Design brief:
The structure is cut from a larger assembly and holds chains A (293 residues) and B (322 residues). Chain A has 293 residues and is of the alpha/beta class. Chain A folds into two domains: 4-109, Four Helix Bundle (Hemerythrin (Met), subunit A) (Up-down Bundle); 110-292, Rossmann fold. Chain A has helices at 4-15, 22-35, 42-57, 63-76, 87-115, 132-142, 160-169, 183-186, 213-221, 248-251, 281-291; strands at residues 123-126, 148-153, 175-178, 193-196, 206-209, 226-229, 261-264, 271-274, 277-279. In chain A, strands 4-6-8-9 form a four-stranded mixed sheet. A three-stranded parallel sheet of chain A has the order 1-2-3, covered by helices on one side. A two-stranded antiparallel ribbon of chain A has the order 5-7. Chain A is globular and about 65 Å long. Chain A starts with a helix and ends with a helix. With 322 residues, chain B is of the alpha/beta class. Chain B is globular, with a radius of gyration of 20 Å. Classes of the chains: A alpha/beta (293), B alpha/beta (322). At the A-B interface, loops of A face loops of B. It is classed as translation. Keywords: Complex, Translational control, translation. The entry is titled "eIF2B-eIF2(aP), aP2 complex". Chain A is Translation initiation factor eIF-2B subunit alpha.
Chain lengths: 293, 322
Protein backbone atom coordinates (compact mmCIF):
# COMPACT_ATOMS: atom_id res chain seq x y z
CA UNK A 1 0.00 0.00 0.00
CA UNK A 2 2.55 2.59 -1.12
CA UNK A 3 0.03 5.41 -1.15
CA UNK A 4 -0.90 5.19 -4.81
CA UNK A 5 -3.36 2.42 -4.07
CA UNK A 6 -4.41 4.80 -1.29
CA UNK A 7 -5.23 7.77 -3.51
CA UNK A 8 -6.74 5.69 -6.31
CA UNK A 9 -9.00 4.03 -3.73
CA UNK A 10 -9.90 7.47 -2.36
CA UNK A 11 -10.89 8.72 -5.81
CA UNK A 12 -12.93 5.54 -6.28
CA UNK A 13 -14.62 6.25 -2.93
CA UNK A 14 -15.27 9.75 -4.28
CA UNK A 15 -16.84 9.03 -7.66
CA UNK A 16 -18.89 6.08 -6.42
CA UNK A 17 -21.00 8.55 -4.41
CA UNK A 18 -19.93 12.21 -4.63
CA UNK A 19 -22.55 13.51 -2.16
CA UNK A 20 -20.96 12.49 1.14
CA UNK A 21 -18.43 14.60 3.02
CA UNK A 22 -14.84 14.09 1.94
CA UNK A 23 -14.02 13.21 5.54
CA UNK A 24 -16.27 10.17 5.92
CA UNK A 25 -14.62 8.89 2.75
CA UNK A 26 -11.27 9.66 4.37
CA UNK A 27 -12.14 7.62 7.44
CA UNK A 28 -13.49 4.77 5.32
CA UNK A 29 -10.32 4.70 3.23
CA UNK A 30 -8.14 4.84 6.33
CA UNK A 31 -10.08 1.92 7.77
CA UNK A 32 -9.70 -0.14 4.60
CA UNK A 33 -6.00 0.76 4.67
CA UNK A 34 -5.81 -0.41 8.28
CA UNK A 35 -7.24 -3.72 7.10
CA UNK A 36 -4.40 -3.82 4.55
CA UNK A 37 -2.03 -3.92 7.51
CA UNK A 38 0.95 -6.12 6.57
CA UNK A 39 2.38 -5.96 10.06
CA UNK A 40 1.18 -5.96 13.69
CA UNK A 41 3.26 -3.44 15.64
CA UNK A 42 1.20 -0.72 17.33
CA UNK A 43 3.81 2.00 16.76
CA UNK A 44 4.62 1.44 13.09
CA UNK A 45 0.87 1.15 12.63
CA UNK A 46 0.04 4.62 13.94
CA UNK A 47 3.07 6.03 12.15
CA UNK A 48 1.67 4.46 8.99
CA UNK A 49 -1.74 5.99 9.73
CA UNK A 50 -0.19 9.44 10.19
CA UNK A 51 1.75 9.13 6.93
CA UNK A 52 -1.55 8.06 5.37
CA UNK A 53 -3.34 11.14 6.70
CA UNK A 54 -0.53 13.28 5.31
CA UNK A 55 -0.70 11.73 1.84
CA UNK A 56 -4.49 12.11 2.02
CA UNK A 57 -4.44 15.84 2.79
CA UNK A 58 -2.03 16.11 -0.15
CA UNK A 59 -5.02 15.91 -2.51
CA UNK A 60 -8.10 17.01 -0.49
CA UNK A 61 -6.97 19.55 2.09
CA UNK A 62 -10.57 20.31 3.05
CA UNK A 63 -10.40 20.65 6.83
CA UNK A 64 -12.79 17.72 6.89
CA UNK A 65 -10.04 15.25 5.92
CA UNK A 66 -7.47 16.22 8.54
CA UNK A 67 -10.04 16.63 11.32
CA UNK A 68 -11.59 13.25 10.59
CA UNK A 69 -8.34 11.32 10.26
CA UNK A 70 -7.01 12.73 13.50
CA UNK A 71 -10.27 11.92 15.30
CA UNK A 72 -9.98 8.41 13.82
CA UNK A 73 -6.54 7.96 15.37
CA UNK A 74 -7.92 9.39 18.61
CA UNK A 75 -10.77 6.90 18.80
CA UNK A 76 -9.08 3.72 17.53
CA UNK A 77 -6.78 3.31 20.52
CA UNK A 78 -9.19 4.40 23.26
CA UNK A 79 -9.53 1.25 25.37
CA UNK A 80 -6.57 -0.80 26.57
CA UNK A 81 -4.62 -3.07 24.25
CA UNK A 82 -2.49 -5.59 26.22
CA UNK A 83 -0.88 -6.43 22.90
CA UNK A 84 0.65 -9.71 24.04
CA UNK A 85 0.22 -10.78 20.39
CA UNK A 86 -0.63 -7.54 18.47
CA UNK A 87 -3.03 -9.28 16.05
CA UNK A 88 -6.15 -9.61 18.19
CA UNK A 89 -5.33 -6.00 18.98
CA UNK A 90 -5.64 -5.06 15.32
CA UNK A 91 -8.92 -6.97 15.32
CA UNK A 92 -10.06 -4.73 18.17
CA UNK A 93 -8.87 -1.68 16.25
CA UNK A 94 -10.81 -2.60 13.12
CA UNK A 95 -13.84 -3.24 15.33
CA UNK A 96 -13.53 0.14 17.04
CA UNK A 97 -13.00 1.95 13.75
CA UNK A 98 -16.13 0.30 12.41
CA UNK A 99 -18.09 1.53 15.42
CA UNK A 100 -16.70 5.00 14.76
CA UNK A 101 -17.81 4.94 11.14
CA UNK A 102 -21.27 3.85 12.30
CA UNK A 103 -21.45 6.92 14.53
CA UNK A 104 -20.38 9.03 11.54
CA UNK A 105 -23.17 7.48 9.47
CA UNK A 106 -25.68 8.31 12.21
CA UNK A 107 -24.47 11.94 12.34
CA UNK A 108 -26.70 13.17 9.51
CA UNK A 109 -29.96 11.70 10.77
CA UNK A 110 -29.23 12.81 14.31
CA UNK A 111 -28.80 16.35 13.00
CA UNK A 112 -32.07 15.99 11.10
CA UNK A 113 -34.05 14.85 14.12
CA UNK A 114 -32.60 17.45 16.50
CA UNK A 115 -32.72 20.52 14.26
CA UNK A 116 -36.00 20.79 12.34
CA UNK A 117 -37.73 21.70 15.59
CA UNK A 118 -36.18 25.14 15.02
CA UNK A 119 -37.54 26.20 11.62
CA UNK A 120 -40.80 27.78 12.79
CA UNK A 121 -43.72 28.00 10.40
CA UNK A 122 -43.67 30.40 7.47
CA UNK A 123 -40.04 31.52 7.55
CA UNK A 124 -37.44 32.13 4.85
CA UNK A 125 -34.33 30.01 5.32
CA UNK A 126 -31.07 31.33 3.93
CA UNK A 127 -28.06 29.14 3.16
CA UNK A 128 -24.77 29.53 1.30
CA UNK A 129 -23.54 26.33 -0.36
CA UNK A 130 -24.10 22.63 -1.05
CA UNK A 131 -24.08 21.70 2.61
CA UNK A 132 -25.46 18.17 2.28
CA UNK A 133 -26.10 18.41 6.01
CA UNK A 134 -28.25 21.47 5.41
CA UNK A 135 -29.90 19.68 2.49
CA UNK A 136 -30.93 16.73 4.62
CA UNK A 137 -32.00 18.85 7.57
CA UNK A 138 -34.08 20.95 5.17
CA UNK A 139 -35.64 17.76 3.82
CA UNK A 140 -36.40 16.53 7.33
CA UNK A 141 -37.94 19.93 8.03
CA UNK A 142 -40.17 20.09 4.94
CA UNK A 143 -41.29 16.46 5.20
CA UNK A 144 -42.48 17.29 8.73
CA UNK A 145 -45.05 19.49 6.93
CA UNK A 146 -43.37 22.71 8.00
CA UNK A 147 -43.78 25.64 5.63
CA UNK A 148 -41.06 28.04 4.53
CA UNK A 149 -39.23 29.42 1.53
CA UNK A 150 -35.51 29.28 0.86
CA UNK A 151 -32.87 31.54 -0.64
CA UNK A 152 -29.40 30.40 -1.61
CA UNK A 153 -26.24 32.17 -2.74
CA UNK A 154 -24.34 30.89 -5.74
CA UNK A 155 -20.91 31.12 -4.02
CA UNK A 156 -19.05 32.25 -7.14
CA UNK A 157 -15.83 30.10 -7.34
CA UNK A 158 -17.78 26.89 -7.88
CA UNK A 159 -21.46 27.66 -8.22
CA UNK A 160 -22.50 25.18 -5.52
CA UNK A 161 -25.54 27.23 -4.59
CA UNK A 162 -26.94 26.62 -8.07
CA UNK A 163 -26.47 22.86 -7.77
CA UNK A 164 -28.22 22.95 -4.40
CA UNK A 165 -31.01 25.04 -5.91
CA UNK A 166 -31.48 22.30 -8.49
CA UNK A 167 -31.43 19.50 -5.93
CA UNK A 168 -33.82 21.54 -3.76
CA UNK A 169 -36.45 22.49 -6.33
CA UNK A 170 -36.21 18.75 -6.94
CA UNK A 171 -37.74 18.66 -3.44
CA UNK A 172 -40.54 21.09 -4.40
CA UNK A 173 -39.54 23.90 -2.04
CA UNK A 174 -39.73 27.53 -3.24
CA UNK A 175 -36.07 28.34 -3.83
CA UNK A 176 -34.29 31.37 -5.26
CA UNK A 177 -30.60 31.65 -6.12
CA UNK A 178 -29.51 35.22 -5.39
CA UNK A 179 -26.11 36.65 -6.25
CA UNK A 180 -23.45 36.06 -3.61
CA UNK A 181 -22.91 39.81 -3.31
CA UNK A 182 -26.56 40.36 -2.35
CA UNK A 183 -26.25 38.68 1.06
CA UNK A 184 -26.87 42.12 2.56
CA UNK A 185 -29.98 42.90 0.53
CA UNK A 186 -31.86 39.70 1.37
CA UNK A 187 -30.56 39.64 4.96
CA UNK A 188 -33.60 41.63 6.12
CA UNK A 189 -36.48 39.54 4.74
CA UNK A 190 -34.93 36.13 5.55
CA UNK A 191 -35.61 35.33 9.19
CA UNK A 192 -32.87 32.86 10.12
CA UNK A 193 -29.79 31.76 8.22
CA UNK A 194 -28.73 28.10 8.27
CA UNK A 195 -25.35 27.09 6.88
CA UNK A 196 -23.22 23.98 7.10
CA UNK A 197 -19.77 24.21 8.63
CA UNK A 198 -16.74 22.44 7.23
CA UNK A 199 -14.58 22.87 10.29
CA UNK A 200 -15.31 24.00 13.84
CA UNK A 201 -12.30 25.40 15.75
CA UNK A 202 -11.94 25.49 19.52
CA UNK A 203 -13.35 28.96 20.17
CA UNK A 204 -16.66 28.15 18.53
CA UNK A 205 -16.44 29.75 15.13
CA UNK A 206 -16.40 27.91 11.84
CA UNK A 207 -14.16 27.65 8.79
CA UNK A 208 -16.57 27.57 5.87
CA UNK A 209 -16.71 28.45 2.19
CA UNK A 210 -15.57 31.93 1.21
CA UNK A 211 -18.95 33.60 1.47
CA UNK A 212 -19.55 33.01 5.12
CA UNK A 213 -17.84 35.76 7.14
CA UNK A 214 -19.78 38.51 5.38
CA UNK A 215 -22.97 36.51 5.86
CA UNK A 216 -22.34 36.03 9.56
CA UNK A 217 -21.54 39.67 10.15
CA UNK A 218 -24.56 40.87 8.15
CA UNK A 219 -26.89 38.48 9.97
CA UNK A 220 -25.45 39.87 13.18
CA UNK A 221 -25.99 43.42 11.95
CA UNK A 222 -29.71 43.06 11.22
CA UNK A 223 -30.10 40.60 14.12
CA UNK A 224 -31.16 37.53 12.17
CA UNK A 225 -30.25 34.56 14.39
CA UNK A 226 -27.50 32.42 12.88
CA UNK A 227 -27.34 28.63 12.85
CA UNK A 228 -24.56 26.39 11.58
CA UNK A 229 -24.83 22.62 11.29
CA UNK A 230 -21.60 20.73 11.94
CA UNK A 231 -21.18 17.00 12.45
CA UNK A 232 -18.87 15.40 14.98
CA UNK A 233 -16.03 14.58 12.59
CA UNK A 234 -15.32 18.27 11.90
CA UNK A 235 -14.09 19.44 15.30
CA UNK A 236 -10.73 20.84 14.24
CA UNK A 237 -7.94 21.77 16.67
CA UNK A 238 -6.88 25.04 14.99
CA UNK A 239 -7.42 28.46 16.51
CA UNK A 240 -7.25 31.33 14.00
CA UNK A 241 -7.84 34.86 15.21
CA UNK A 242 -7.94 36.70 11.89
CA UNK A 243 -8.17 35.76 8.24
CA UNK A 244 -4.41 35.26 7.98
CA UNK A 245 -4.55 32.70 10.80
CA UNK A 246 -6.09 29.83 8.80
CA UNK A 247 -3.00 27.96 7.52
CA UNK A 248 -2.33 27.89 3.79
CA UNK A 249 -2.77 24.11 4.01
CA UNK A 250 -6.48 24.84 4.51
CA UNK A 251 -7.18 27.99 2.49
CA UNK A 252 -6.34 27.53 -1.15
CA UNK A 253 -6.73 23.75 -1.68
CA UNK A 254 -5.50 24.30 -5.26
CA UNK A 255 -2.27 22.28 -5.44
CA UNK A 256 -4.01 38.52 -7.58
CA UNK A 257 -6.15 35.51 -6.74
CA UNK A 258 -8.79 34.25 -4.30
CA UNK A 259 -9.03 32.28 -1.06
CA UNK A 260 -11.57 29.48 -0.66
CA UNK A 261 -12.41 28.86 3.00
CA UNK A 262 -12.35 31.32 5.88
CA UNK A 263 -13.23 32.03 9.48
CA UNK A 264 -16.26 33.15 11.47
CA UNK A 265 -16.01 34.12 15.14
CA UNK A 266 -18.16 32.58 17.90
CA UNK A 267 -20.00 35.84 18.58
CA UNK A 268 -21.54 35.99 15.10
CA UNK A 269 -22.96 32.48 15.64
CA UNK A 270 -26.00 31.82 17.80
CA UNK A 271 -26.36 28.02 17.97
CA UNK A 272 -24.27 25.20 16.54
CA UNK A 273 -25.65 21.80 15.57
CA UNK A 274 -23.72 18.58 16.16
CA UNK A 275 -24.75 15.03 16.73
CA UNK A 276 -23.57 15.73 20.26
CA UNK A 277 -26.65 17.96 20.41
CA UNK A 278 -27.27 21.68 20.18
CA UNK A 279 -24.37 23.76 21.47
CA UNK A 280 -23.54 27.33 22.11
CA UNK A 281 -20.11 28.00 20.60
CA UNK A 282 -18.37 27.72 23.96
CA UNK A 283 -19.63 24.16 24.17
CA UNK A 284 -17.42 23.71 21.14
CA UNK A 285 -14.39 24.38 23.31
CA UNK A 286 -15.52 22.20 26.20
CA UNK A 287 -16.84 19.24 24.19
CA UNK A 288 -13.87 19.51 21.83
CA UNK A 289 -11.24 19.15 24.52
CA UNK A 290 -13.46 16.35 25.84
CA UNK A 291 -13.90 14.70 22.43
CA UNK A 292 -10.25 14.76 21.40
CA UNK A 293 -9.57 13.66 25.00
CA UNK B 1 -69.46 23.22 55.40
CA UNK B 2 -71.70 20.79 53.50
CA UNK B 3 -70.90 19.69 49.94
CA UNK B 4 -71.81 21.75 46.88
CA UNK B 5 -74.56 20.34 44.67
CA UNK B 6 -75.13 21.79 41.21
CA UNK B 7 -78.21 20.97 39.15
CA UNK B 8 -77.77 21.43 35.40
CA UNK B 9 -80.40 21.47 32.68
CA UNK B 10 -79.38 19.99 29.35
CA UNK B 11 -81.68 21.65 26.81
CA UNK B 12 -83.44 25.00 26.72
CA UNK B 13 -87.20 24.55 26.89
CA UNK B 14 -87.83 27.33 24.38
CA UNK B 15 -85.74 25.71 21.68
CA UNK B 16 -84.09 28.46 19.61
CA UNK B 17 -81.56 26.47 17.58
CA UNK B 18 -84.13 25.43 15.01
CA UNK B 19 -83.89 23.74 12.62
CA UNK B 20 -80.39 22.63 13.56
CA UNK B 21 -81.49 21.45 17.01
CA UNK B 22 -83.46 18.56 15.48
CA UNK B 23 -80.26 16.73 14.54
CA UNK B 24 -78.62 17.06 17.97
CA UNK B 25 -79.61 19.19 20.97
CA UNK B 26 -77.82 22.43 21.77
CA UNK B 27 -75.96 20.88 24.71
CA UNK B 28 -74.32 18.62 22.11
CA UNK B 29 -73.39 21.39 19.69
CA UNK B 30 -69.69 21.85 18.83
CA UNK B 31 -68.92 25.25 20.32
CA UNK B 32 -65.21 25.17 19.51
CA UNK B 33 -65.11 21.54 18.40
CA UNK B 34 -66.22 20.73 21.97
CA UNK B 35 -69.60 19.92 23.50
CA UNK B 36 -71.12 22.79 25.46
CA UNK B 37 -71.84 20.25 28.19
CA UNK B 38 -68.07 19.88 28.49
CA UNK B 39 -67.65 23.63 28.94
CA UNK B 40 -70.25 23.86 31.67
CA UNK B 41 -68.98 20.73 33.40
CA UNK B 42 -65.39 21.96 33.31
CA UNK B 43 -66.79 25.14 34.86
CA UNK B 44 -68.57 23.31 37.67
CA UNK B 45 -65.38 21.33 38.22
CA UNK B 46 -63.40 24.57 38.44
CA UNK B 47 -65.73 26.12 41.00
CA UNK B 48 -65.44 23.08 43.26
CA UNK B 49 -68.60 21.09 42.52
CA UNK B 50 -68.78 17.45 43.52
CA UNK B 51 -72.12 16.58 41.88
CA UNK B 52 -73.82 17.69 38.65
CA UNK B 53 -77.37 16.33 38.53
CA UNK B 54 -77.57 16.70 34.76
CA UNK B 55 -81.28 16.68 33.89
CA UNK B 56 -82.27 15.80 30.34
CA UNK B 57 -85.58 16.04 28.51
CA UNK B 58 -84.75 15.78 24.80
CA UNK B 59 -82.40 13.59 22.73
CA UNK B 60 -81.31 12.36 26.15
CA UNK B 61 -79.99 9.11 24.69
CA UNK B 62 -77.48 11.00 22.54
CA UNK B 63 -76.47 13.14 25.52
CA UNK B 64 -76.01 10.08 27.72
CA UNK B 65 -73.92 8.15 25.21
CA UNK B 66 -71.75 11.20 24.64
CA UNK B 67 -71.31 12.26 28.27
CA UNK B 68 -70.20 8.72 29.02
CA UNK B 69 -67.13 9.67 26.94
CA UNK B 70 -66.24 12.46 29.38
CA UNK B 71 -63.71 12.82 32.15
CA UNK B 72 -66.48 13.11 34.76
CA UNK B 73 -68.15 9.78 34.00
CA UNK B 74 -65.24 7.73 35.33
CA UNK B 75 -64.68 8.16 39.10
CA UNK B 76 -61.22 9.59 38.38
CA UNK B 77 -62.43 13.20 38.45
CA UNK B 78 -64.32 14.33 41.55
CA UNK B 79 -67.26 15.96 39.76
CA UNK B 80 -69.47 12.88 39.51
CA UNK B 81 -72.25 13.39 36.97
CA UNK B 82 -75.54 11.61 37.68
CA UNK B 83 -77.56 11.69 34.47
CA UNK B 84 -81.35 11.82 34.68
CA UNK B 85 -83.36 11.24 31.50
CA UNK B 86 -87.09 11.99 31.41
CA UNK B 87 -89.87 13.49 29.32
CA UNK B 88 -92.48 14.23 32.01
CA UNK B 89 -90.96 17.56 33.05
CA UNK B 90 -91.12 20.39 30.56
CA UNK B 91 -89.74 23.50 32.29
CA UNK B 92 -87.24 24.55 34.93
CA UNK B 93 -90.18 24.96 37.23
CA UNK B 94 -90.80 21.33 36.38
CA UNK B 95 -87.09 20.57 36.85
CA UNK B 96 -87.07 21.95 40.36
CA UNK B 97 -90.35 20.28 41.25
CA UNK B 98 -88.56 17.13 40.05
CA UNK B 99 -85.70 17.95 42.42
CA UNK B 100 -87.92 18.54 45.44
CA UNK B 101 -89.79 15.34 44.62
CA UNK B 102 -86.58 13.31 44.40
CA UNK B 103 -85.32 15.27 47.45
CA UNK B 104 -81.78 15.37 46.07
CA UNK B 105 -80.03 18.58 47.02
CA UNK B 106 -79.01 19.70 50.48
CA UNK B 107 -78.41 23.35 49.55
CA UNK B 108 -76.59 25.85 47.36
CA UNK B 109 -77.11 24.04 44.07
CA UNK B 110 -75.63 26.06 41.22
CA UNK B 111 -78.66 26.12 38.97
CA UNK B 112 -76.84 26.39 35.66
CA UNK B 113 -78.39 26.12 32.21
CA UNK B 114 -76.97 23.80 29.58
CA UNK B 115 -74.56 25.84 27.49
CA UNK B 116 -73.10 28.32 29.96
CA UNK B 117 -69.57 29.27 28.91
CA UNK B 118 -67.54 30.68 31.79
CA UNK B 119 -64.61 30.34 34.16
CA UNK B 120 -66.18 32.00 37.18
CA UNK B 121 -64.79 31.17 40.62
CA UNK B 122 -68.10 31.54 42.43
CA UNK B 123 -66.49 30.72 45.77
CA UNK B 124 -66.27 34.43 46.64
CA UNK B 125 -69.87 35.30 45.80
CA UNK B 126 -70.88 31.91 47.18
CA UNK B 127 -69.16 32.67 50.47
CA UNK B 128 -70.90 36.03 50.67
CA UNK B 129 -74.25 34.41 49.91
CA UNK B 130 -73.83 31.68 52.50
CA UNK B 131 -72.93 34.53 54.85
CA UNK B 132 -76.20 36.30 54.06
CA UNK B 133 -77.93 33.01 54.84
CA UNK B 134 -76.10 32.19 58.09
CA UNK B 135 -76.60 35.77 59.30
CA UNK B 136 -80.25 36.52 58.45
CA UNK B 137 -82.25 33.27 58.80
CA UNK B 138 -82.11 31.91 55.25
CA UNK B 139 -84.23 34.67 53.74
CA UNK B 140 -81.96 35.41 50.78
CA UNK B 141 -82.67 32.92 48.02
CA UNK B 142 -81.09 33.26 44.58
CA UNK B 143 -77.77 35.08 44.69
CA UNK B 144 -77.38 35.42 40.92
CA UNK B 145 -74.11 36.06 39.09
CA UNK B 146 -73.83 38.97 36.68
CA UNK B 147 -70.91 40.25 34.63
CA UNK B 148 -70.19 43.81 33.51
CA UNK B 149 -70.20 44.74 29.85
CA UNK B 150 -70.99 47.63 27.78
CA UNK B 151 -74.37 47.42 26.04
CA UNK B 152 -72.75 47.34 22.60
CA UNK B 153 -70.42 44.33 22.99
CA UNK B 154 -71.15 41.81 20.20
CA UNK B 155 -72.02 39.39 23.02
CA UNK B 156 -75.36 41.21 23.36
CA UNK B 157 -77.92 40.11 20.82
CA UNK B 158 -80.48 42.75 21.79
CA UNK B 159 -82.97 39.96 22.51
CA UNK B 160 -81.06 39.23 25.74
CA UNK B 161 -80.12 42.34 27.76
CA UNK B 162 -81.42 43.15 31.25
CA UNK B 163 -82.32 46.06 33.53
CA UNK B 164 -82.01 45.60 37.27
CA UNK B 165 -82.57 47.91 40.23
CA UNK B 166 -80.39 46.83 43.16
CA UNK B 167 -79.85 48.06 46.71
CA UNK B 168 -76.12 48.63 46.28
CA UNK B 169 -75.34 48.62 50.01
CA UNK B 170 -76.42 44.99 50.53
CA UNK B 171 -76.28 44.50 46.75
CA UNK B 172 -79.69 42.78 46.75
CA UNK B 173 -82.03 42.95 43.79
CA UNK B 174 -85.11 45.18 43.93
CA UNK B 175 -86.47 44.85 40.40
CA UNK B 176 -85.55 42.61 37.48
CA UNK B 177 -86.73 43.26 33.94
CA UNK B 178 -86.05 41.97 30.46
CA UNK B 179 -85.75 44.46 27.61
CA UNK B 180 -86.41 42.48 24.42
CA UNK B 181 -88.25 45.42 22.86
CA UNK B 182 -89.15 47.85 25.67
CA UNK B 183 -87.65 51.08 24.34
CA UNK B 184 -88.82 52.47 27.71
CA UNK B 185 -88.17 51.18 31.22
CA UNK B 186 -90.96 51.05 33.80
CA UNK B 187 -90.35 51.01 37.55
CA UNK B 188 -92.80 50.80 40.48
CA UNK B 189 -91.93 53.39 43.12
CA UNK B 190 -92.33 50.67 45.77
CA UNK B 191 -88.72 49.74 45.07
CA UNK B 192 -87.73 53.16 46.41
CA UNK B 193 -90.24 52.53 49.19
CA UNK B 194 -88.18 49.42 49.78
CA UNK B 195 -84.97 51.40 49.17
CA UNK B 196 -85.06 53.85 52.08
CA UNK B 197 -81.30 54.37 51.67
CA UNK B 198 -80.56 54.67 47.94
CA UNK B 199 -81.40 52.29 45.10
CA UNK B 200 -79.20 52.01 42.02
CA UNK B 201 -80.45 51.04 38.57
CA UNK B 202 -78.03 49.09 36.38
CA UNK B 203 -78.10 48.18 32.72
CA UNK B 204 -74.48 47.19 31.99
CA UNK B 205 -75.04 43.84 33.73
CA UNK B 206 -75.11 40.66 31.66
CA UNK B 207 -76.73 37.45 32.86
CA UNK B 208 -75.04 34.10 33.38
CA UNK B 209 -77.78 32.02 35.12
CA UNK B 210 -75.06 30.75 37.52
CA UNK B 211 -77.57 31.72 40.22
CA UNK B 212 -77.08 30.05 43.55
CA UNK B 213 -80.23 28.67 45.11
CA UNK B 214 -81.59 26.94 48.22
CA UNK B 215 -83.88 24.11 49.24
CA UNK B 216 -86.21 27.11 49.56
CA UNK B 217 -86.18 27.61 45.78
CA UNK B 218 -87.68 24.14 45.35
CA UNK B 219 -90.02 24.61 48.32
CA UNK B 220 -91.20 27.72 46.46
CA UNK B 221 -91.56 26.26 42.96
CA UNK B 222 -93.53 23.27 44.23
CA UNK B 223 -96.31 25.69 45.27
CA UNK B 224 -96.89 27.49 41.96
CA UNK B 225 -97.28 25.44 38.79
CA UNK B 226 -97.65 28.57 36.64
CA UNK B 227 -93.87 29.09 36.52
CA UNK B 228 -92.20 28.51 33.16
CA UNK B 229 -88.70 30.02 33.57
CA UNK B 230 -86.46 31.24 36.37
CA UNK B 231 -87.22 34.77 35.14
CA UNK B 232 -90.92 34.35 35.90
CA UNK B 233 -89.76 32.97 39.25
CA UNK B 234 -87.87 36.21 39.85
CA UNK B 235 -90.91 38.30 38.95
CA UNK B 236 -93.31 36.29 41.10
CA UNK B 237 -90.94 36.51 44.04
CA UNK B 238 -90.57 40.24 43.38
CA UNK B 239 -94.30 40.95 43.57
CA UNK B 240 -95.32 38.86 46.62
CA UNK B 241 -92.81 40.20 49.16
CA UNK B 242 -95.33 40.47 52.01
CA UNK B 243 -94.29 37.51 54.21
CA UNK B 244 -90.85 35.84 54.29
CA UNK B 245 -89.98 38.12 51.39
CA UNK B 246 -87.02 36.07 50.14
CA UNK B 247 -85.21 38.90 48.42
CA UNK B 248 -83.03 37.91 45.49
CA UNK B 249 -79.43 39.13 45.60
CA UNK B 250 -77.32 40.32 42.71
CA UNK B 251 -73.60 39.63 42.75
CA UNK B 252 -71.15 40.74 40.09
CA UNK B 253 -67.54 39.89 39.24
CA UNK B 254 -65.44 41.70 36.66
CA UNK B 255 -62.30 39.78 35.60
CA UNK B 256 -64.07 36.62 34.44
CA UNK B 257 -66.17 35.70 31.43
CA UNK B 258 -69.69 34.30 31.20
CA UNK B 259 -72.49 33.71 28.70
CA UNK B 260 -75.10 31.26 27.45
CA UNK B 261 -75.21 30.61 23.71
CA UNK B 262 -78.95 30.83 23.18
CA UNK B 263 -79.13 31.69 19.47
CA UNK B 264 -76.94 31.61 16.39
CA UNK B 265 -75.67 35.14 16.95
CA UNK B 266 -74.60 34.87 20.58
CA UNK B 267 -73.06 31.56 19.55
CA UNK B 268 -71.00 33.26 16.86
CA UNK B 269 -69.96 35.74 19.54
CA UNK B 270 -68.94 33.23 22.20
CA UNK B 271 -67.14 31.08 19.63
CA UNK B 272 -65.04 33.87 18.16
CA UNK B 273 -64.56 34.84 21.79
CA UNK B 274 -63.32 31.57 23.29
CA UNK B 275 -60.98 31.30 20.32
CA UNK B 276 -59.29 34.50 21.52
CA UNK B 277 -58.36 33.08 24.93
CA UNK B 278 -60.96 35.31 26.56
CA UNK B 279 -61.96 32.66 29.11
CA UNK B 280 -58.63 31.05 30.26
CA UNK B 281 -58.19 28.36 31.80
CA UNK B 282 -60.91 27.01 29.50
CA UNK B 283 -58.97 27.79 26.31
CA UNK B 284 -59.17 25.65 23.14
CA UNK B 285 -55.67 24.13 23.14
CA UNK B 286 -55.36 23.49 26.86
CA UNK B 287 -57.60 20.51 25.97
CA UNK B 288 -59.30 20.47 29.36
CA UNK B 289 -61.17 17.42 28.04
CA UNK B 290 -58.13 15.24 27.41
CA UNK B 291 -59.44 13.61 24.22
CA UNK B 292 -56.61 13.15 21.74
CA UNK B 293 -58.84 14.28 18.86
CA UNK B 294 -58.55 17.89 20.12
CA UNK B 295 -54.89 18.67 20.72
CA UNK B 296 -53.70 21.96 19.25
CA UNK B 297 -50.53 24.04 18.88
CA UNK B 298 -50.71 27.82 19.36
CA UNK B 299 -49.07 30.29 16.98
CA UNK B 300 -49.02 33.96 15.98
CA UNK B 301 -52.47 35.58 16.11
CA UNK B 302 -53.93 32.46 17.76
CA UNK B 303 -53.92 30.51 14.52
CA UNK B 304 -54.24 27.12 16.17
CA UNK B 305 -53.31 23.81 14.58
CA UNK B 306 -54.35 20.30 15.51
CA UNK B 307 -52.60 17.08 14.53
CA UNK B 308 -52.37 16.24 10.83
CA UNK B 309 -53.41 19.53 9.26
CA UNK B 310 -51.26 19.65 6.11
CA UNK B 311 -52.18 23.12 4.91
CA UNK B 312 -51.55 23.67 1.22
CA UNK B 313 -48.95 25.99 -0.23
CA UNK B 314 -50.27 29.54 0.07
CA UNK B 315 -53.05 29.27 2.68
CA UNK B 316 -52.61 32.55 4.51
CA UNK B 317 -54.10 31.76 7.92
CA UNK B 318 -54.77 35.22 9.31
CA UNK B 319 -56.02 34.83 12.87
CA UNK B 320 -58.24 32.87 15.25
CA UNK B 321 -58.44 29.92 12.85
CA UNK B 322 -58.86 26.76 14.83
Amino acid sequence: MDDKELIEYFKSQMKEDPDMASAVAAIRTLLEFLKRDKGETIQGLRANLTSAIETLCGVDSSVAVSSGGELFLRFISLASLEYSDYSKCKKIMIERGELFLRRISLSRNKIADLCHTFIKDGATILTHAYSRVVLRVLEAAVAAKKRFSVYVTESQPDLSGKKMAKALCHLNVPVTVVLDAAVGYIMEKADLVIVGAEGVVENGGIINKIGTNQMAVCAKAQNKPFYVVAESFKFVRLFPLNQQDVPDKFKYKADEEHPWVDYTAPSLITLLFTDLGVLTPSAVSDELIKLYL
Amino acid sequence: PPPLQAVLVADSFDRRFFPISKDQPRVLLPLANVALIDYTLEFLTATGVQETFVFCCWKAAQIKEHLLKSKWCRPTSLNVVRIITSELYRSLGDVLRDVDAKALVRSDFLLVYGDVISNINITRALEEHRLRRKLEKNVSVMTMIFKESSPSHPTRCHEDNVVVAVDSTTNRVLHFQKTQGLRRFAFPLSLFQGSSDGVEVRYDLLDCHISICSPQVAQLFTDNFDYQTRDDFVRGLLVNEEILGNQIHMHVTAKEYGARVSNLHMYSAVCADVIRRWVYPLTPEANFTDSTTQSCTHSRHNIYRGPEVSLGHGSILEENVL
